[PDB]
Design a protein around this motif. Structure first.
Motif, PDB file in Angstrom:
ATOM      1  N   UNK B 339       1.632  -0.542   8.480  1.00 11.98           N
ATOM      2  CA  UNK B 339       1.631  -1.565   7.435  1.00 11.98           C
ATOM      3  C   UNK B 339       0.512  -2.581   7.679  1.00 11.98           C
ATOM      4  N   UNK B 340       0.278  -2.922   8.938  1.00  5.99           N
ATOM      5  CA  UNK B 340      -0.840  -3.806   9.284  1.00  5.99           C
ATOM      6  C   UNK B 340      -2.165  -3.169   8.859  1.00  5.99           C
ATOM      7  N   UNK B 342      -2.497  -0.798   6.468  1.00  5.53           N
ATOM      8  CA  UNK B 342      -2.431  -0.812   5.003  1.00  5.53           C
ATOM      9  C   UNK B 342      -2.891  -2.150   4.425  1.00  5.53           C
ATOM     10  N   UNK B 343      -2.393  -3.242   4.989  1.00  4.20           N
ATOM     11  CA  UNK B 343      -2.796  -4.585   4.574  1.00  4.20           C
ATOM     12  C   UNK B 343      -4.316  -4.748   4.624  1.00  4.20           C
ATOM     13  N   UNK B 346      -6.261  -2.785   1.904  1.00  6.02           N
ATOM     14  CA  UNK B 346      -6.113  -3.430   0.604  1.00  6.02           C
ATOM     15  C   UNK B 346      -6.866  -4.768   0.523  1.00  6.02           C
ATOM     16  N   UNK B 352      -4.963   1.991  -1.676  1.00 10.21           N
ATOM     17  CA  UNK B 352      -4.310   2.685  -0.566  1.00 10.21           C
ATOM     18  C   UNK B 352      -2.811   2.811  -0.749  1.00 10.21           C
ATOM     19  N   UNK B 353      -2.296   3.997  -0.429  1.00 11.60           N
ATOM     20  CA  UNK B 353      -0.871   4.232  -0.277  1.00 11.60           C
ATOM     21  C   UNK B 353      -0.490   4.236   1.193  1.00 11.60           C
TER      22      UNK B 353
END
Ligand SMILES: N[C@@H](Cc1c[nH]c[nH+]1)C(=O)O
Ligand SMILES: N[C@@H](Cc1c[nH]c[nH+]1)C(=O)O
Ligand SMILES: NCc1ccc(Br)cc1
Ligand SMILES: NCc1ccc(Br)cc1
Lengths: 407, 405
Positions: B339-340, B342-343, B346, B352-353
């Motif tokens: 998730x870090x 992913x952040x 973006x 991004x998924x």
């Protein structure tokens, strides 16, 4: 005169008002793209049968419905989610999961406003709270993109499973849970529950007044689904970096029949406005529509009116005037043909350009250029033309430029 | 089961169908921007009074109308132009002219499709044919942008002023001109309006004339229509779209309110209905009660015929969904770190998924392919300790967190 006002409770969007709407929708679209959601749409006109849920919802109470010349019961959609489910159910086995779909439908009601736009984001085929995490993060992202901070806004988060367990332990029939939620969403709430069918109401109110997840765990256990899911949810949002944006609130249930799990809503931290957005998990909806297999879903709606109010208060909606790159000005009517050749070139190169359409003097053409927010004025005069040139004047004083080097 | 089909004559747009619509609307928007037009919108629900023009138009014959709970006669707009006029009349003196406004409203009918989207482009406050030139050029530009050429399509151009003069010379009352146009757009019907055989003879003869020179012989070279059409064709030639346009004396359009130049787009194979249609309507705002006449011209351009044409010409390949990155946690214990990542992706402006449910890497990779990812970012424990992730280009090796974006 014809009536210049729009139909009751509906908004006109002349260019000024359209630019503000566009600024908002650009964020919704860009946020969807950033998060990998795909656009869809469906007719604003749906069958009335689509919305008959029989839970006393505010949304089904305020339907804009009518009978076609032909005798069919239709409605201007009050929300998008049932249209989504219809599409999903229509695809059935052919739809590859997970699916992340978004839209920005106008939705309707009949009761001041009878009409709003509502950004919808939904995730389909994901059982776990990561769906809710992404959805909540997407809503924060949109607000952040518009200039808001975690000091301005937040998202209140809860699970309906807590209330379900309490209601269920009182021997309350499962078919009564949705009405209970529609009621609890609203001293008149004490009377309405009795009618649905005192000690049970006591228990409901007590748990909704609990101010932390730890206090929920004391009541229903730390391994209860809701507790594990909410803890996972908050861990993930923290990890994504939006922990300051989210918090627990046990009184959040939402007004819709179909939520089964986590529910949430956005709010301004000054307590001035109604909800900015609202959503949750609705794992049973497609089963009720007749899906032969259960289909997990979660999503939110995010209206176009409250956010704009909040952005206006916070001074984040300055008027952005219309802009165009170039205004082509024929020195006189005999230069119009040449000016059109110039105009063509500018547009072929990917520039936005006007040409002065009517007959007017150069200084008035220059004024019009300023009014429409031109960055550059291109004067097409006989003497420059013979030299393979035009005059360029930057507006953001004046010189000749070769035709080839304008773009 | 609930009914999965949409309401009669209305279309669903699941993602696949939405991408095609979006590809079309992107052109309409980009063309409007290129031409300096400003977007507007208004409610799909309007008062029925707005459309009562009393000329026997097909459009007013096929109105999707109903009575509100409250007894008000409303309608789902059959067209946008009257909504535009309402807005224009509402602004009155405050509107700075000229104004160039566009929109892409869904419009409705009840009779077959009951619903379409229609790009509208209108120019307000410009007396001269340069308005019609720009409008016609904008329509060509849109078609060109979609991949069509002047070999595929064209715009037929005429003026209603020619027919006006002919009708007027027969002593026909001015209030009969709009009905005559609505009829001629489609022998017996003109007699009912009140025209004898010789007047019908004259109408048909002039509409069959095949050139502007032949029009000049009949009504004079000084006649407004002749001067305006010549100016029009000179300007389109000068802009470089002369191959796209031509004269056709039988083009009148079906709407009551056109007063001058009218035009319509067509496929040069004669397979399809009109691609777009428009013209000048200088009296409309006077009829709505404007104290001063307001020149206007514009067109509509539907979303259905163009798509048919583009499908025939093979210009609508399916464009599959795309995303830049798919972040894949090696397992559930790597989700927080993923998730870090992913952040970060973006924040840098990337699409991004992250794999949302629990699954094995190879299945996550398959999903990545299905959603059209350019790049797969695997977040594994061993790489993470080294301040790295694994990157695999789809359209494998370790990469530092800082150098992903
Ligand atoms: N339809 C819900 C929002 C929503 C969209 N998806 C899931 N929930 C509402 O209008 O409140
Ligand atoms: N309203 C016209 C198109 C148009 C827009 N502006 C002028 N004409 C039609 O539907 O055919
Ligand atoms: N969610 C608040 C709201 C609902 C419908 C309309 Br229409 C406007 C606002
Ligand atoms: N311009 C043709 C047309 C009109 C209305 C609908 Br709905 C569809 C097409």
């Amino acid at each position: 005169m014809v009536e210049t006002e729009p139909v009751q409770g509906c908004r006109d969007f002349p260019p000024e008002a359209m630019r503000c709407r566009r600024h908002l929708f650009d964020v919704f679209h860009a946020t969807a793209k950033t998060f990998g959601f795909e656009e869809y749409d469906a007719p604003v006109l749906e069958s009335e049968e689509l919305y008959i849920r029989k839970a006393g919802e505010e949304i089904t109470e305020q339907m804009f419905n009518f009978i076609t010349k032909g005798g069919h019961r239709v409605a201007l959609r009050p929300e998008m989610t049932p249209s989504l489910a219809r599409l999903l159910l229509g695809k059935g086995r052919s739809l590859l999961l997970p699916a992340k779909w978004y839209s920005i439908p106008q939705c309707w009601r009949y009761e001041r406003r009878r009409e709003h736009y509502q950004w919808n984001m939904d995730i389909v085929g994901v059982k776990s709270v990561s769906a809710e995490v992404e959805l909540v993060c997407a809503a924060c992202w949109a607000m952040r993109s518009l200039g808001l901070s975690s000091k301005d806004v937040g998202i209140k988060v809860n699970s309906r499973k807590v209330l379900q367990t309490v209601v269920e332990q009182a021997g309350v029939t499962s078919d009564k849970f949705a009405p209970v939620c529609v009621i609890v969403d609203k001293e008149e709430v004490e009377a309405q529950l009795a009618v649905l069918g005192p000690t049970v109401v006591d228990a409901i109110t007590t748990t909704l007044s609990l101010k932390s997840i730890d206090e929920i765990a004391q009541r229903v256990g730390e391994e209860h689904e809701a507790v594990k899911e909410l803890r996972q949810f908050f861990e993930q949002v923290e990890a994504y970096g939006y922990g300051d944006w989210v918090l627990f609130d046990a009184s959040v249930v939402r007004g819709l029949a179909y939520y089964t799990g986590i529910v949430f809503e956005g709010f301004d931290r000054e307590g001035k406005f109604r909800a900015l957005c609202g959503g949750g998990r609705y794992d049973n909806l497609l089963t009720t529509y007749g899906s032969p297999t259960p289909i997990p879903c979660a999503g939110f709606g995010f209206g176009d009116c409250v956010i704009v109010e909040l952005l206006q208060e916070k001074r984040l909606l300055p008027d952005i005037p219309h802009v165009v790159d170039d205004v082509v000005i024929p020195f006189d009517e005999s230069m119009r043909p040449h000016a059109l050749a110039v105009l063509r070139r500018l547009r072929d190169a990917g520039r936005s350009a006007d040409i002065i359409l009517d007959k007017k003097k150069v200084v008035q053409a220059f004024n019009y250029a300023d009014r429409v927010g031109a960055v550059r004025a291109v004067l097409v005069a006989p003497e420059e033309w013979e030299r393979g040139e035009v005059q360029v004047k930057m507006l953001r004083r004046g010189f000749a430029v070769p035709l080839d080097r304008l773009v």
